[PDB]
Amino acid sequence: LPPAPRYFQGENTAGFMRPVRFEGDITNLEVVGEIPKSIEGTFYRVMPEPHLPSFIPNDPWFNGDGNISGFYFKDGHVDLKQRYVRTEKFVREAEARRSLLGKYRNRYTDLVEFKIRSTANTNIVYWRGQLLALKEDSPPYAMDPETLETFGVYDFDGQLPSLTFTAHPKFDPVTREMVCFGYEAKGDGTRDICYYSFGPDGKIAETVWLVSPVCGMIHDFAVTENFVIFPIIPLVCDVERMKQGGDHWQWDYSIPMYIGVLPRRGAQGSDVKWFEAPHGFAGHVANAFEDDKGHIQLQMAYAKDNVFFWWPDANGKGPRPGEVEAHFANFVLDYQSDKLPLAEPTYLVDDDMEFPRIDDRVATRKHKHTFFCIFDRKPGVTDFEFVMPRAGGGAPMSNGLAHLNHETGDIQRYLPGPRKLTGECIFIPRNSEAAEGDGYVMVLLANYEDMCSELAVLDTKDLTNEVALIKLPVRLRPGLHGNWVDKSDVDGHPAPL
Amino acid sequence: LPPAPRYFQGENTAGFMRPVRFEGDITNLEVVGEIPKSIEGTFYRVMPEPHLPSFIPNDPWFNGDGNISGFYFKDGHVDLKQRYVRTEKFVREAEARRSLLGKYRNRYTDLVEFKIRSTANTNIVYWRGQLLALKEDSPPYAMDPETLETFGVYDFDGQLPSLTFTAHPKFDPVTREMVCFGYEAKGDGTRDICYYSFGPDGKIAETVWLVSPVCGMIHDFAVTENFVIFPIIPLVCDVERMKQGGDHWQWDYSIPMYIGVLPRRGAQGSDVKWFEAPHGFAGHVANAFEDDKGHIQLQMAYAKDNVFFWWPDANGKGPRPGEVEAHFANFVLDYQSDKLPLAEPTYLVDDDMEFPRIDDRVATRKHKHTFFCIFDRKPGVTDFEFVMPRAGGGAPMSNGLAHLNHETGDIQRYLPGPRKLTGECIFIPRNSEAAEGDGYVMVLLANYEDMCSELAVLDTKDLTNEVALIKLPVRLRPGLHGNWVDKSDVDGHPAPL
Ligand SMILES: [Co+2]
Ligand SMILES: [Co+2]
C-alpha cells in the first residue's frame, strides 16, 4: 500500500492550517466585553480537518474529515462542544489508523471499496430535531444537536430519491419546507439532477428529475416563491479521466455559466429552461426572489475565471492564487422568455466578496440586507508580511465583513485587525419582533498573532465594534459553512417577517 | 459576592501558563522519529488548570483544578485522553459558572461551605484497577484508567483512617503494599500524622497515629524495609492567622528540618524519633534504603532556603524567584542513635535539581540509577530572552534531564533545546527481564517557539538523543507528577528485580 505518513507535511497543513484534531468540550469560554444576555441558542459550524495524514500529496482542503463545532449560548455564558462526524471514511480509517480514501471525488483511487465517500465537511444544518452534516457527493449524516453524536447516513425515512444531497438546501420561512436537490444524482459523471423538497412534517413533496446540459458542478442554488434556479459552475466531470487517476473536475472555457430555471411545483423535467449567462464562476447565492413583474432577481457571488484554480482546463490553463475576485452580482431572469443568452449582471458593490448571508426570515422573498465576507487588498488592512508565513495554503481568505443595506445603499465594514482573518458569519434576530437585519452577527476569527481562534459578536446597529470577543485557547482551522439555531424557534428556524 | 472575572489575568495565567481547559480526545498523535513498538501502556500525568478565573488575585499554581492526561501507547501509535477530576470544587463551580473556593487551604475565604476542598491536582497513581487523583489536604478521588471518568471520593472500602492522603505514597515492589500517610490528619492546623498501609488485596495493614513537633508541611516521605521517614518542610500552619484571611503556610527560620523515623511495622506513636537536620527545604524523595549496617540512606532534593517563596515568614522575609537552588542530598540516619541533631548531608551531584525518579522495581531497597530534572543557568542552555516573556510565572523551570549512575558516577544529560523546558520524567523498563535503569524515559516538553507541548521518548542507552518526539497541537500547561502503567503488569506496578 502507498505509505501512510505519521505527521502532516505540505503547505495545505502548515501554520494555521495544521490539523488539531481534538474532540470534546471547553466550557465557560473566556470573554472580553459582554455577550448580550438575551442571546440564547447554538452556533454550529463545520471545518474540513484531516484526522489522519493523507497518502495523496497536496490533498485539497475540500477533502478533509468534517469536524463539527457547537457554541452553546445562554445568559451571557458560552460553551464549546466539538466532535468529528462518524462517516464511513472516518470510522474505517480510525480502525486502520491510516488514510484509505484517496483523491477528491475519485473512488478509483481509494485503497478499499467505500459505500459512502462523504467527509460531511461542507455545511451543518438543523432539520426536525437533528443536525444534517452535508457533502454534495453524498446523502446527509444525521447528528444529535445536543451531544454531536452521529446517528448515521440519513435517508429521510427511506424517501430520499437521490444519491446526492446539496450542501445548500433552502428553508422557506412561510411554508416551512426544506427545498433540496442533488447533481450527479445517479452516480459519477451523470447529468441527472434530482430536485426534491420536504414539508415540515418530514414528508417528501416535490421530486423532479431533470438533465443538465453538461456534467457540471452545481454547488449552490436559489429558490423563489414559484421557481428553483440552478447555476452551473463550468467545472466538468469525465468519468473516463477519473478511471485513469485524474481529477473529478476540469474547467471548460468553451461553455457559458448555465442557469436553469424550473417551476417550483408540479413540473416535469422537460419544463426546465437552461439560460446562458456570460462565462464565469457561480459563487454562493445570497438569495433570490420574484419582483412585481414576476421576473427572478438572483443575487450571488460571480467571478470571471476559475476560482478553483487547482482544477484547471484540459491543457493546465488557469489563474494563480489570489488573482480571481468574485463580485456581488444581480442576474435578471424571466421563465417566459425564449431568449437563452442573458445580459452581464449589475453589481451591487465593488468589493472582492463571498459567503453571503441574509436574514433568513425573508429567504425566497425580497431581502434588503446582506452580510458577507470581503477580501480587501487596500494596503494595511492585512499585514501580509506577518500573516502569510503563518497561514499555510488551500483556503480562501477574508479580512472583514460587510453589511449592505439594499434600500439606502449604505455599507458598514467590520475589520477585525491587521493580523486576523474571518470565516462565514451568522445573523441572529434581536428577538421575534425585530426588523429585517436587526440583531447580532457572529463570526469566527483566526488570530495569527496568538495562533488561536476567537468568536466575535457584533450588533447590527454598529458592525465596526465588537460587543464581545470570545477567546479560544486552541485553533479552529479555517472552515466552511455554519448556522444559528435559536432556542425560541421550535423547529430550529426563525419565523417569517 | 466578590466579582467573578470572565477572562484570566495575572502572570500566573499568562503566556504558556494560560489555561486551555479542554477535555476529550486527540487520537493518533503526530510523531517525528519512531516510538519503539515494544512499548505498551499508559503515561498518566496531572496538571493544575483553573477551570474558572479565580476571585483571588495571583492565586498560586498549586490551587488549580486537577486535569488528567493519559497517553495510551501500542505498536508505535499513541492517543491522548484528557479529563478534569470531578471534585466537589469542580462540580459546584461548574454548576455556578463562577469560582467559589478561595485561598489555598483556607476554608475561611470560601464563598460556600465545602465538605471536600481537593483540587486533586498533585499526583495520579494506579491502585487495584483505579486511578487515584491525589491532593495532600484530602482523600483521593478514584477514577477509571480507561475513560478517566471520576467515580468519586475514595475511602478504601470505609477503612481510610485519616482525613488526608499524601500525594506521594510508595509502592513496595516485593510486598505489593501501598505505603501511605496523611499530615494535618484531623483537620486544619492539627499536628496529627496518620501512617497507614494497604496490602495488595486492599485490606488496611498498618495504622499508627503520631504527633509532629510543629504543624509543618510533610509533602513527601520515604519507606525502607523496616522504617518510614517523615521530612518536615519548615512551613508552619496557624489556624488563627487563617481565620483572619491569612496564608495556611508561613515559613519559620527558627526551626530545624525535622526528620521523623518510625518502625514500619507494629509501632506505637511514641516510638517515633524526631531527628533534627540543618534548617532547609525538604524537596522530593528519590528513594531511601537500609545499608549493610542497618542505617537509613535518604536521598532527596534539599535546599537551604524557602523554595515556596510566595509563603514567606511572619515579617515577609524570604527569597526571590529563581534564587533558591535544590541539590541532590544524602542524609544518613540511625533509628538507634539518641543524638537528635544530624550532620550536613553529602551531595551526589552539583546540579540545581528536582523531580527525581528511580526504577521503581527497587523502591525501598538499594537503587543505583536516578533520573531527575535539572535547571542549568550556564549561558546558552536556555534562551531566557525569548522564553521568559512567553512563560508566565508560578511554576518551576527545568531545562534538561539527568541520569546518574550511582556506582560509576557517570551522568548523562538530555537538553531538549534553548527554547524548550521539561516536566517530570517517567521511566519504563525495557521489558520484564531488563536490568535496573535500562529502558525508556518519557518527558513532556513545553515548546515556547511553537507554543505547543511535545512528548519526548528517550532510550537510556543514550539519553542525549530523542528516539521519538510526539507533537501535540495544543499546550499542556506545566504540571506536577505522573506515572507509567505498563500493560504487562496486571496490578499496574512493575515486578521486583
Ligand atoms: Co458552499
Ligand atoms: Co510532589
PDB file of N, CA and C and ligand atoms in Angstrom, chain A residues 122 136 167-168 219-220 284 355 480-481, ligand 1:
ATOM      1  N   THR A 122     -19.001  20.232   4.650  1.00  0.00           N
ATOM      2  CA  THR A 122     -19.318  21.448   3.912  1.00  0.00           C
ATOM      3  C   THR A 122     -20.326  22.356   4.616  1.00  0.00           C
ATOM      4  N   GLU A 136     -21.828  17.372  -0.883  1.00  0.00           N
ATOM      5  CA  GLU A 136     -22.652  17.339  -2.106  1.00  0.00           C
ATOM      6  C   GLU A 136     -22.529  16.070  -2.970  1.00  0.00           C
ATOM      7  N   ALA A 167     -25.161  20.686  -0.340  1.00  0.00           N
ATOM      8  CA  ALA A 167     -24.739  21.367   0.876  1.00  0.00           C
ATOM      9  C   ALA A 167     -25.510  22.662   1.153  1.00  0.00           C
ATOM     10  N   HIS A 168     -26.363  23.085   0.221  1.00  0.00           N
ATOM     11  CA  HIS A 168     -27.071  24.342   0.341  1.00  0.00           C
ATOM     12  C   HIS A 168     -28.565  24.215   0.114  1.00  0.00           C
ATOM     13  N   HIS A 219     -22.960  23.724  -7.071  1.00  0.00           N
ATOM     14  CA  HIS A 219     -22.684  23.833  -5.642  1.00  0.00           C
ATOM     15  C   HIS A 219     -23.830  24.448  -4.856  1.00  0.00           C
ATOM     16  N   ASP A 220     -24.426  25.502  -5.401  1.00  0.00           N
ATOM     17  CA  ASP A 220     -25.480  26.233  -4.714  1.00  0.00           C
ATOM     18  C   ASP A 220     -26.668  26.334  -5.662  1.00  0.00           C
ATOM     19  N   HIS A 284     -21.509  31.582  -4.239  1.00  0.00           N
ATOM     20  CA  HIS A 284     -22.665  31.331  -3.376  1.00  0.00           C
ATOM     21  C   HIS A 284     -23.831  32.296  -3.642  1.00  0.00           C
ATOM     22  N   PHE A 355     -19.379  34.261   0.601  1.00  0.00           N
ATOM     23  CA  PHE A 355     -20.062  33.831   1.813  1.00  0.00           C
ATOM     24  C   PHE A 355     -21.181  34.793   2.252  1.00  0.00           C
ATOM     25  N   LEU A 480     -15.861  25.961   6.614  1.00  0.00           N
ATOM     26  CA  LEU A 480     -16.822  26.279   5.595  1.00  0.00           C
ATOM     27  C   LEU A 480     -18.065  26.852   6.272  1.00  0.00           C
ATOM     28  N   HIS A 481     -19.234  26.245   6.089  1.00  0.00           N
ATOM     29  CA  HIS A 481     -20.483  26.898   6.447  1.00  0.00           C
ATOM     30  C   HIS A 481     -20.911  26.633   7.891  1.00  0.00           C
TER      31      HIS A 481
HETATM   32 CO    CO C   1     -20.896  26.401  -0.053  1.00  0.00          CO
END
